[PDB]
Each structure stands twice: as structure tokens, then as C-alpha cells.
């Protein structure tokens, strides 16, 4: 039923964590196994989910059309935009591009893995600014 061992922000930290995923090539490899396909593009952020968690506390914005569940960093964060360099789905290699911009990540209540309890863990990534 509901995930396990991979809280919402946890699944998104293996899919969008730059603190030290081991090269987008490998960071994306964990996604090709959970997606059985290489999304072709994957972005990551370089800030501890505890700091990104608090970063996701600044004013939000009507995500869909009034969801108000996104949160843009109050400044430029050393993020990393990885892209699929080439190879295919079972042999796709990515390149990590270290960029610095204020992005927008969405948040949700700590499922069950809750690294601590946050109450708005950094789950999705609305966009990069």
C-alpha cells in the first residue's frame, strides 16, 4: 500500500538529493531501477533535507491552480541539474551540472520513514529558478 523505508522526501532524495548521491550517473541509476526506464532528465539539489526541509518553509505558490504546496528557496541554492548524456534505459549515463538558483520543492507530512518528523518534508520539486 503506502511506501516504506522511503518516505516521500526520502524517495525524492534518492531521486533529487545532491548532498552526495554518487554522480548523477549512479543517482539516476537508482531511478532507472525504480522506474524501469531512464527519465532522460533528473535534477538534484545540494542542501540537507533538514535545511531544504526548512527552505521549503518560505511562502508557497498555487502549485497546480491553488494547491499552494510548492516552496521556492529564499535565494540561490547550489543545486545540480543532471541530464541523460546517452546510452539507453539499461545503459544511460548522466552528467552532473552544478548550478546555483532558487528552486521550488513541494512538501508533505513525514510518511512513516520520517527522518525526524519535519511535518513538511521536502518531497517533490516544482521547478528550478
UniProtKB/Swiss-Prot annotation:
Site annotation Critical for catalytic activity: residues: 39
Main localization of the protein described in the UniProt heading: secreted
UniProt subcellular location: Secreted
Similarity remark: Belongs to the pancreatic ribonuclease family.
Name this protein carries in UniProt: Ribonuclease 7
Result when mutating residue 39 to A: Loss of catalytic activity. No effect on bactericidal activity
Binding site for dUMP: 16, 39, 42-43, 124, 127
BP terms from Gene Ontology: antibacterial humoral response; antimicrobial humoral immune response mediated by antimicrobial peptide; cytolysis in another organism; defense response to fungus; defense response to Gram-negative bacterium; defense response to Gram-positive bacterium; innate immune response
GO molecular function: endonuclease activity; lipopolysaccharide binding; nucleic acid binding; peptidoglycan binding; RNA nuclease activity
Protein role: Exhibits a potent RNase activity. Has broad-spectrum antimicrobial activity against many pathogenic microorganisms including uropathogenic E.coli (UPEC), and remarkably potent activity (lethal dose of 90% < 30 nM) against a vancomycin resistant Enterococcus faecium. Causes loss of bacterial membrane integrity. Probably contributes to urinary tract sterility. Bactericidal activity is independent of RNase activity.
Disulfide bond residue pairs: 24-82, 38-92, 56-107, 63-70
Domain of life: Eukaryota
Swiss-Prot/TrEMBL induction comment: Up-regulated in response to the cytokines IL1B, IFNG and TNF. Strongly up-regulated in response to the bacterium P.aeruginosa. Moderately up-regulated in response to S.aureus, E.coli and S.pyogenes. Up-regulated in kidney in response to infection.
Keyword annotations: Antibiotic, Antimicrobial, Disulfide bond, Endonuclease, Glycoprotein, Hydrolase, Nuclease, Secreted, Signal
